[PDB]
Symmetry: C5
Subunit: 206 residues, 5 copies
């Protein structure tokens, strides 16, 4: 109790808040998707609704501490409002993302943070061919909304999207699921933009 | 009035807030479901909507007091924001859980807390066979979202889900309702995770 | 301005907030429903949507003052967040209650408070027979969620639900509307629980 | 910049907030509706959805200033949170009113305020006869929720509801639109209550 | 870290907040739409749902700084609550606009700001003829809600609405997309009101 209370007090009340990465001190942030259900497909609109955990990991020095000065406490939990989180956003969404879990993060003595919100996303997807045997493929970039490759680097830990939480009797069956880092420049803008393309080939169960 | 005001002042204003369990001082939390209606079933999506109370009980020493120093007050009510509550969450939900009751808890002189939110949940469930006589069975884990078996232990008081509040003329009729503790490890993460699996066999009303 | 500003400052800034009733100083709270429309009926789910004002009245000594010390001010208005309100809740709801009015209360020099939120409620109700001439009857308890009969007593002023605000051309026509105090004990719990049962017999409009 | 900053500082930061009208210093508030679309009608429920601007004007002495002491500034804009606004409410609504515009007001040196929120309202209305040529008529009171005639007086500037913003190809066509002050007493309560009845006769487009 | 923290502290904590344009110091604000999907059409109501980024650019002197006094920092990111943003609003919407991106802006040493919210809008539109080959045309003004032409001037950078982000397999296909500045006066009232008319011809 009294240890962790002090630890938190030292980190949050007695700096000003971490104002997010610059070109000078860029930051690396690490995504991992965990598919759960393809809930719905709507062929009137080309909107598909998808449910998943999204594990985000990054590391900050303003969040380091020595376990020894604080009761051999290696890691704690905290409301994600108490800290800076990255602005990772689905570029092709059609409705604001619905949050399905608590907004709580896990900070570790080395300054690393893990934050794994559950979400229901509706995004742009032409689902015709979903009843066919070959299936249909759908994609959605996840990018920082305001930060370039110069300030935030995205990475996957792995190209495989973890289907271990995926619902056995979902109306739809996952053939392929890949999460792939990507760079682009755009004609608008000098800098490189990084994103993680989430790609899912799927079809109706039988 | 002036007694209870002091009691609350001593507990909340004059520590820092209880920052939740660690491996060192783990915490046991106790669930009991109280089914109420299976409101809807949707076979396009395999989404089922379910309504229930969820009684959570835990106990903290930072919440003990002596009735005698505080006007023989054995227990009080408080907004659930004034206190730490556990982060118990349906793992298979498809839409954010809707709260149907006040967010208010009951603290007792011995430091035990009871908090019993009403909720409407939509979760993943293939309902085909719900018109059959044998029915269809559906499940949903309830787990802490950030805390392992090392920090929070879940338990049921009983394997029977209390159907006493269940709606007589619900469109669906409950055949079986079980709430069962469970342990797993997952490949992501070193520690064990506890959960309470809620399992409900049900089917359309008839005679 | 400057009188009422002082009055409010004395009441809210210079006590603690009223920490709600105990067995020792129980509190009586008084409901009156004012039906407005039966908006919708859904026979797939047995959900009925109902719209109404709910007048709550209670009285507190921490809210007394002398009109003479404060500019002959007999009563003021305030956001319902500035004060304790009771946690009166529909026990059989299926979706979170939608608020239709401002959350504002009226406090009076004698310490009595009046608070009359408009609301749209969906609750459990089998509406089959609503097209028949005899109609169909529907009920829903309104209870405090965390407080027993020992801490909060509910009462109606009257068994008649006020239909004066009820919509002339509602899709449904009200045959009976009653608000009836009630006591129960349950096997779960030692104490008595009070509630106000709202009961409404109704059917489709004709010519 | 620097003038208006001072003006605002003097008005908002260095009084207490205006705690709203009493019998002693009542207040007059002035409504004007501007119909825009009758979006939908639902004959299962007798719910109609209507979209409009609602111009509210009132005047306060706590908001007067001399243009000369403040850079000849006659009027400014401000978030409607920075000031008291009246609690004008549709008495027969069936779902909470959806706000379609910014919450911003206009204050003038004489202490008058103008605030014109756009809104989508669902209210109680039997629409049968809406396909007929004669149409169907619908009403909704707009009242202060907690303030009587003794504390707040409502008035229209005009009995005509301004149809100039109304949508040409709305599914429904407006035959009559009137906004009419009204007094009632109600059996619960001693005082008079003022309201502005909005009445709209309308029918399906040819 | 500690540089940018100081920069922000000097700008926001140690002035009053920029209280927005007056006739005296008017402000020019620059819109550019980036269409993305026409998601839905509803011919019962004459409501169409449209998804897009909306790039807003303006410039303030209260936001200038010298890169040299602040660690050669040329530009930073900030929550759009920390700063004044313009109140640009769709005049014909039928439901409150849904926000699809973070509410975050980009401020630059010269005092210019860029803020590019993603949005899903439902607005008034008769879509009959959308299955025809000629298509159907729909429009919606975007205006400041409380500010006249005297206080805020809108401009497009270009009459072409950028369709580069538009979804290949959208249910609807864009024939024309134009963003056009506009003035209107009203007989009641002395001032001009500026708006940017967004106009989109499209079909199945
Ligand atoms: O339309 C664009 C093009 C480009 O798309 C790739 C992703 C990017 C990340 N964010 C999301 C919004 C965006 C932006 C800002 C200002 C105008 C248009 C605009 N976008 C994207 C842009 C980059 C940068 C930025
Ligand atoms: O990969 C998973 C699945 C697994 O689900 C069982 C319960 C758990 C408790 N929380 C919920 C989120 C979760 C987690 C953390 C980081 C990445 C993925 C992820 N999840 C669950 C996981 C455990 C651990 C943790
Ligand atoms: O299952 C019930 C029904 C019973 O209803 C009478 C009123 C009561 C007051 N509160 C509201 C929630 C409730 C409660 C707590 C824990 C498990 C079940 C449960 N409820 C109600 C109950 C009592 C006690 C308590
Ligand atoms: O009894 C009622 C109905 C009536 O509705 C029309 C307008 C009014 C303005 N406010 C809204 C709440 C109300 C009120 C206060 C206390 C008990 C009942 C009650 N209501 C409305 C009433 C008036 C007065 C007051
Ligand atoms: O009815 C109108 C139309 C007119 O539209 C051009 C742009 C304007 C900007 N804002 C948006 C709301 C509006 C307004 C306020 C109060 C009553 C009517 C009204 N509107 C618009 C008006 C102007 C001014 C103002």
């Amino acid at each position: 109790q009294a240890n962790l209370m002090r630890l938190k007090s030292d980190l949050f009340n007695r700096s000003p808040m971490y104002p997010g990465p610059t070109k000078d001190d860029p930051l690396t942030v690490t995504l991992g998707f965990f598919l759960q259900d393809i809930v719905k497909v709507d062929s009137s609109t080309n909107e598909v609704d998808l449910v998943y955990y999204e594990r985000q990991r990054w590391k900050l020095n303003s969040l380091m501490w020595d376990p020894n000065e604080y009761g051999n406490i290696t890691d704690f939990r905290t409301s994600a409002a108490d800290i800076w989180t990255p602005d990772i956003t689905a570029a092709s969404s059609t409705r604001p993302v619905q949050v399905l879990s608590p907004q709580i993060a896990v900070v570790t003595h080395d300054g690393s943070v893990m934050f794994s919100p559950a979400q229901r996303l509706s995004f742009m997807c032409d689902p015709t061919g979903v009843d066919s045997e070959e299936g249909v493929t759908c994609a959605v970039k996840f990018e920082s909304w305001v930060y370039s490759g110069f300030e935030i680097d995205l990475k996957t830990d792995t190209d495989q999207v973890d289907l271990s939480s995926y619902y056995a009797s979902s109306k739809y069956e996952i053939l392929s699921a890949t999460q792939t880092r990507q760079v682009q420049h755009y004609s608008c803008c000098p800098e490189p933009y990084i994103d993680v393309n989430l790609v899912v080939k799927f079809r109706e169960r039988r």
